[PDB]
Amino acid sequence: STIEEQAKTFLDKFNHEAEDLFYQSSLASWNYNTNITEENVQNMNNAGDKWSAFLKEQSTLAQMYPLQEIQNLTVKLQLQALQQNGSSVLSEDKSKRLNTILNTMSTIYSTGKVCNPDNPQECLLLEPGLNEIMANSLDYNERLWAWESWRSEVGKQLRPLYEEYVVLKNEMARANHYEDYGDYWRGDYEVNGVDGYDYSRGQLIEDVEHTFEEIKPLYEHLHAYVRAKLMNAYPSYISPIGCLPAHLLGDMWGRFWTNLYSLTVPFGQKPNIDVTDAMVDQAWDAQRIFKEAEKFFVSVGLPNMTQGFWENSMLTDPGNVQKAVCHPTAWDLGKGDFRILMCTKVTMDDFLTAHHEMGHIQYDMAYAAQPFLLRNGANEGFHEAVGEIMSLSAATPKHLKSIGLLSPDFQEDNETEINFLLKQALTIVGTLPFTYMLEKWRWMVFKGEIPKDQWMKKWWEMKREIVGVVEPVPHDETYCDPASLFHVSNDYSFIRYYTRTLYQFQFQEALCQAAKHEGPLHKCDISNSTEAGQKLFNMLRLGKSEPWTLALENVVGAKNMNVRPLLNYFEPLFTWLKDQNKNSFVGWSTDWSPYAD
Amino acid sequence: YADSFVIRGNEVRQIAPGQTGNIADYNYKLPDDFTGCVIAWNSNKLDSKVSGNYNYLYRLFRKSNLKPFERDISTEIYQAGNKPCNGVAGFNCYFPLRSYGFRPTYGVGHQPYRVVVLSFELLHAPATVCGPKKSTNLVKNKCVNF
């Protein structure tokens, strides 16, 4: 009864119950996901309902213990995570209104239908075909149509709903001593009073705007190259001092330039590394690939699979007609019962996805000792970060020719290396300007700096200034372009895909500087080492029990994200791009327009 | 003396002289001068029934830790706060018994293990029962050491 006893003795009970219930819920869910029937939806909805009701009751009960009389750090962190009101601080009818606006937004996004002006009877959804038209077509007219349509029919309906959504979320967040909603998102990177490891909510914006400054020397050259290359497929449509038209990037919103590899390959007659026929000519099943992944993981010094994962998991899609959503996922039903749900085919891409998923499996195996409320990554970003380095280290030619899938006399050269590096940088450094731009735009519109009659003009001037792309058609203020992105119209945070891109290469360099590697970083492997495994595992097992700025400094040695490893990873590509642009004009002028000529 | 019960997987490390934890603290306490013999094995296929088998309980609230070889079976509602409970669950008045919910799809360290312990003690008796002897055919007509 030391004013904290109720804190520790409450916490226990909670712990137990929580864990148990959660498990019930989760088994239920895995079920429905692997065997789609009509009754299983009911078997899982009530389990989720009971879990949610129990958690909200415990949250309403935890309030009775003040948060300044606690002295131990871990119990204070657990209470601070549980004591969160979340929603339901609003007026009751406004809560239902918020649920309706959210669900209506999600539905209007999901079931969008756009139809041709030449044939309005049968037409296209978003997922089947629209992405294919925007990715694989090659005529300017069809791309411009597919681009303007989706923003003229799904951008116009969403604005009068997003307007109310903003103010409702702001009034929600403003009851928990917060000043807007964006701060309620940045609050994930917050650390209070640990004598030096503190990280104020504000300094996240400072880091982001301070690390985006060092990327531009590389992104500018990449933009110049991609532009001078796109000036071949569509002759006399781009200006050599202008920006790019949004409907030429490779998808609906311009998030990944990966589909531009067909037009901008450096050496179009030297094929890259690809183990796809060598696999099937060796009769590899879904079992063999996972055995290879586990062998690689155990080679570095991590434990085996739990021997309950080989009988329960579903590695190959069920033969008969058994509807199960084929989207890879790593389940941690808790209680040490880990599973992997994915419809593996015999392709090297699935061979890399297996590694990327067993990464999450290992990361979940590590921290299974912490209290139940601390079973996550250090923040939202570390999870996929620690996941992706396995795929980045398993795709190098060394690890391939050491497993029996490449001819021993396969000799790699600098041409194939530049090819691979551009294929990588079309995805890694390509999405960063878009990500930072969209997140800054959302923070701005939430804090109230941008008046609600200047949304689209500000968004497009930002697309002109930062990322270097220009709209093809004018858009007045009956539109809303950002509401046409999945992570926006569904109330999903969108800054993790910018911190992950940095944490990735920081982890890569920090780790395989212990494997005593000597060459460029893009050939670096973490196999056969034991110091690397220990350095990684001394962070994998913390969970949330320590501030993330300590989880970093125990791996790389710094107390923040630093972009230098990224540039050090791309240095060869940068040396090449500095030569292939001796005659073009780097950068872009925000005056050019595709219609004002 | 022969004791037997069932406990979780990763808690068998607590049936040993001089340990601590939610199980060994106050469910079963072995002394510091133990002379017995601990046996413990896995019984997943015999005691775990899908959907939850809520028969086995384990106390996790008590005033103070136990005494060696002592036994406590009460069901008095705990009291952590300062206000007396009057036997009603709720705020700072917790039920003292929970249940292991075993299922066959658990990992090692959570499947039910069965534990038995032997303990000897020689009060004053000089003959309560000796161990097992050897075997062989007694030869005859030979000078032998018998």
Ligand SMILES: *[C@@H]1O[C@H](CO)[C@@H](O[C@@H]2O[C@H](CO)[C@@H](O)[C@H](O)[C@H]2NC(C)=O)[C@H](O)[C@H]1NC(C)=O
């Ligand atoms: C997928 O779920 C369905 C819906 O229950 C299962 O179908 C029945 O499941 C019960 C459960 O024991 C069986 O007794 C019936 O014989 C099943 N009937 C049919 C027509 O399937 C189905 O078995 C589940 N699939 C798997 C692989 O377990």
Ligand SMILES: *[C@@H]1O[C@H](CO)[C@@H](O[C@@H]2O[C@H](CO)[C@@H](O)[C@H](O)[C@H]2NC(C)=O)[C@H](O)[C@H]1NC(C)=O
């Ligand atoms: C209160 O904080 C202390 C340390 O500040 C925690 O002590 C650790 O407890 C764990 C198990 O709970 C042990 O494995 C560690 O060895 C302990 N650390 C040290 C330095 O002895 C203590 O657990 C915290 N209280 C609670 C209820 O978690």
Ligand SMILES: *[C@@H]1O[C@H](CO)[C@@H](O[C@@H]2O[C@H](CO)[C@@H](O)[C@H](O)[C@H]2NC(C)=O)[C@H](O)[C@H]1NC(C)=O
């Ligand atoms: C969470 O919401 C509650 C309202 O439901 C806020 O108000 C506190 O509510 C608790 C119990 O419901 C009271 O004991 C407090 O006196 C209330 N006021 C406070 C704590 O200032 C509560 O403030 C909200 N949580 C936070 C962290 O602000």
Ligand SMILES: *[C@@H]1O[C@H](CO)[C@@H](O[C@@H]2O[C@H](CO)[C@@H](O)[C@H](O)[C@H]2NC(C)=O)[C@H](O)[C@H]1NC(C)=O
């Ligand atoms: C890949 O490596 C080869 C050999 O190391 C390079 O070939 C030489 O490149 C320099 C660079 O200007 C030229 O001056 C030489 O004339 C090249 N050698 C021959 C025999 O012609 C090649 O350039 C490298 N690839 C790239 C893209 O630079």
Ligand SMILES: *[C@@H]1O[C@H](CO)[C@@H](O[C@@H]2O[C@H](CO)[C@@H](O)[C@H](O)[C@H]2NC(C)=O)[C@H](O)[C@H]1NC(C)=O
């Ligand atoms: C690095 O790891 C690989 C993976 O096991 C080890 O590969 C073995 O290498 C020896 C000799 O090079 C071969 O005889 C074995 O057949 C290989 N094993 C497999 C499964 O292919 C390699 O030994 C490790 N490196 C070192 C220095 O031990």
Ligand SMILES: *[C@@H]1O[C@H](CO)[C@@H](O)[C@H](O)[C@H]1NC(C)=O
């Ligand atoms: C992992 O499993 C293999 C089975 O092939 C076994 O030989 C090895 O000893 C195991 N290692 C550990 C650490 O459990």
